[PDB]
Design a protein around this ligand. Structure first.
Ligand SMILES: CNc1cc(Nc2cccnc2OC)nc2c(C(=O)NC3CC3)cnn12
Length: 256
C-alpha cells in the first residue's frame, strides 16, 4: 500500500551538499513559489534498498505531527531516487550540541526530550516504528537559547528502512540500535529514545561511539548496562528486554 507524492524532476533544483545519510547524500534544494527543501539522493542501490527507502517515504507521507519533519514526496531523476523532505533551519542536533558544548542548559535539553517524546507518543499510538531515533535525525527548527525563547525540533524521516540494512550498518548504529535488532516493534524506539537522551545529556557525544565494531558488538553480547546521564528514565528505556521498556505515555508524563 505504498502512498506518496511523485515529484517530477522538473520541479527540483539541487544546491549545496549537506552530508551523508545511510546510503544517501543530503543537499539543500528547491521545490517549485519555490520552497527551500532537502533532497536525499539514494546511492546506486539494489531494488531491496530502494523498496526500504520508498517504504520510509510512504510511512512519513501518511503521518502528521508538529515534531515530525514533512516529506514532500519522491523524485526519480534519471537513475537516482530522491526523497524531498523538510529543510530544517539549524540542521541536525548531534552536530549542533558538539559545536555548542558546555553552554546548552539542561532545561533546554528537557524541552527537546519532551518534544521528541511527544513525536514518539504519536507514533506509538499509531503503532508505527521510526527505527532510527538519534541526535542526527533530530533537526533544530528554532534555537531557543535567547532569554524568553524555547527550542523546537523535527524528527527526520528514518531514511532507508532498518530492515534492509547490513549487519555492519546495524553495528554502526549502536547504541541507538535496540539490541533485539542486531541479529520490528515500537519497543525499539524506546531504546533509541533512551540512547538519544544520553547523547543529548552528553552534548552530542553518544556512549560507545569511539569504540570499534567488535567492541560495540561485544558490549551488546555481554548485555552490558549503558551509562547513567533522566537516569531512572534512560535505565528503563535502555532495558535489554523490550517488553520492560516504559510506554511513551509514561515517558511523557515522567518528563513533565
Ligand atoms: C540545515 N538544514 C539541514 C542540514 C542537514 N545537514 C546534514 C545532513 C546529513 C548529514 N549531516 C548534516 O549536517 C552535518 N540536514 C538536514 C535535514 C535532514 O533531514 N537531514 C538528514 C539527516 C536527516 C533537514 N534539514 N537539514
Amino acid at each position: 500500500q505504498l502512498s506518496f507524492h511523485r515529484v517530477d524532476q522538473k520541479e527540483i533544483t539541487q544546491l549545496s551538499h549537506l552530508g551523508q545519510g545511510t546510503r544517501t547524500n543530503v543537499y539543500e534544494g528547491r521545490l517549485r513559489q519555490e520552497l527551500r527543501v532537502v533532497l536525499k539522493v539514494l546511492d546506486p542501490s539494489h531494488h531491496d534498498i530502494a523498496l526500504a527507502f520508498y517504504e520510509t517515504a510512504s510511512l512519513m507521507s501518511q503521518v502528521s505531527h508538529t515534531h515530525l519533519a514533512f516529506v514532500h514526496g519522491v523524485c526519480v531523476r534519471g537513475p537516482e531516487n530522491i526523497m524531498v523532505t523538510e529543510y530544517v533551519e539549524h540542521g541536525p542536533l548531534d552536530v549542533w550540541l558538539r559545536r555548542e558544548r558546555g553552554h546548552v542548559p539542561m532545561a533546554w535539553k528537557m524541552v527537546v526530550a519532551q518534544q521528541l517524546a511527544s513525536a514518539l507518543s504519536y507514533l506509538e499510538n499509531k503503532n508505527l516504528v521510526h527505527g532510527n531515533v538519534c541526535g542526527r535525525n533530530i533537526l533544530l527548527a528554532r534555537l531557543g537559547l535567547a532569554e524568553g525563547t524555547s527550542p523546537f525540533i523535527k524528527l527526520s524521516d528514518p531514511g532507508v528502512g532498518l530492515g534492509a540494512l547490513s549487519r555492519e550498518e546495524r553495528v554502526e548504529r549502536i547504541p541507538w540500535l535496540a539490541p533485539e535488532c542486531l541479529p520490528l516493534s515500537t519497543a525499539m524506539d524506546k531504546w533509541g529514545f533512551g540512547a538519544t537522551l544520553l547523547e543529548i545529556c552528553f552534548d552530542g557525544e553518544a556512549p560507545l561511539q569511539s569504540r570499534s565494531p567488535s567492541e560495540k558488538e561485544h558490549f551488546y553480547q555481554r548485555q552490558h548496562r549503558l551509562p547513567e546521564p533522566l537516569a531512572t528514565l534512560t535505565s528503563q528505556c535502555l532495558t535489554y528486554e523490550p517488553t520492560q521498556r516504559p510506554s511513551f505515555r509514561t515517558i511523557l508524563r515522567d518528563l513533565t
